[model samples]
Target: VRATYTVIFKNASGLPNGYDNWGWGCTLSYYGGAMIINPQEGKYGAVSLKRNSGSFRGGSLRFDMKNEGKVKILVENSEADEAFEVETISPSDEYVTYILDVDFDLPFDRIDFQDAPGNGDRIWIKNLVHSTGSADDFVDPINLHH
Candidate 1:
């Protein structure tokens, strides 16, 4: 990625820069400037956001996640056809901010929030920042919350 982008899921569900929504088996809701994702019962779930162009690479992904259950966050490259599990997070009383720096073995694109059909595994994601810049370059998500 040549430049960086920040996405606030405020009343929108599409990717910031026209990425295709390849999501499956998950319910999506938008409210209070956040996107809430819940896995459907008894089915595999993935919040797959993709771009056919596949023009992204090793960058930082930072976001605020709120939930009571765990989810595996991932990134994928079309060429390799394999997904990389970059991080996993669980729910808490307050939103937990994650700053993940992806080191792509090859060209990579797409971000997925994956679940294996569980109950009470809803997550609220907000202020998503995907940057070609270093994670340390950004301000703390907690500061952004206000």
Candidate 2:
């Protein structure tokens, strides 16, 4: 099965500027031409992008994370009161595209990108895309700065 949702954060035309904050600390703001994420201080900091009105199954989430730091990609199902950490990685500042394949038994309606605690780290992200299918079903990956 293949379903894809592409979210381009650069224009902010159809995307919401609001986000849901989780954990004890962290903030999400639009700055420097991208979504600037600052994880909580000394505690875990996570923020979920505005909820999309739908459900998705197994697929991949791809995006660009600028700056060198670690962050967790979370798929959340509020109605089910469950969240799954699909992947975590240390991202560099070179606009590298990170793709994570997640197969959730339950459907997820939102996606959260979180930072490691006490790292005093900031991340710049754009071109957030989610697809519900095999990797071959998606298009070529694109960089945020391009």
Candidate 3:
């Protein structure tokens, strides 16, 4: 089994409120507190969250997304500098699950979600799941129940 760290927005009420807002650019809170990348504002927009000094050995980063657009993930260190890997995802109309195998150079303290240039607007992220071992470590939301 793999160690996994997941973030489901269901627990949060609003942006800059539920989650720690490390930084934001060219983006806004929408969909009852979700995040949307606005291209009209500028070519760049991103949101970063503090990991609270967690030890990550590198595994797979997965998430569910809705709408049409592309976004990149960046792992940052305490100095707010890019730490390990950067991955990109392009989502379609139907909610899709994206997975990326990443290897980090060092343990990072922050993670950033950045919108890709020219492909923005109406992009909503529903789930963020990161596994420190294997992709199979994190179970799909559909399989979870009360």
TM-score of each: 0.78, 0.78, 0.72
lDDT of 1 by residue, 1-146 (tens): 23565553433453555666687888787776667777886565778877656466676788877875778888888667888888777657687778888776665667888774366377777766676766777555446566
C-alpha local distance difference test of each model: 0.70, 0.68, 0.60
Q: Write the per-residue lDDT of candidate 3 for residues 28-135, one digit (tens) a residue.
A: 556643455454446566666675545455676666666556767777677646655467776578767776666776666666777666445556665566667666
RMSD of each: 3.3, 3.3, 3.2
TM-score of 3: 0.72
lDDT of 3 at 116: 64
Clashing pairs in 3: none
Number of backbone-clashing residue pairs for each candidate, in the order shown? 1, 2, 0
Model 1's alpha-carbon lDDT is 0.70
Backbone clashes (count) for model 3: 0
Candidate 2 lDDT by residue in tens digits, 12-109: 33335444444447666676557777775676676676454556676888777775578777887889998888888776767777777876778877
Angstrom error at residue 41, model 1: 2.4
- Candidate ranking under TM-score, highest first, comes to 1, 2, 3
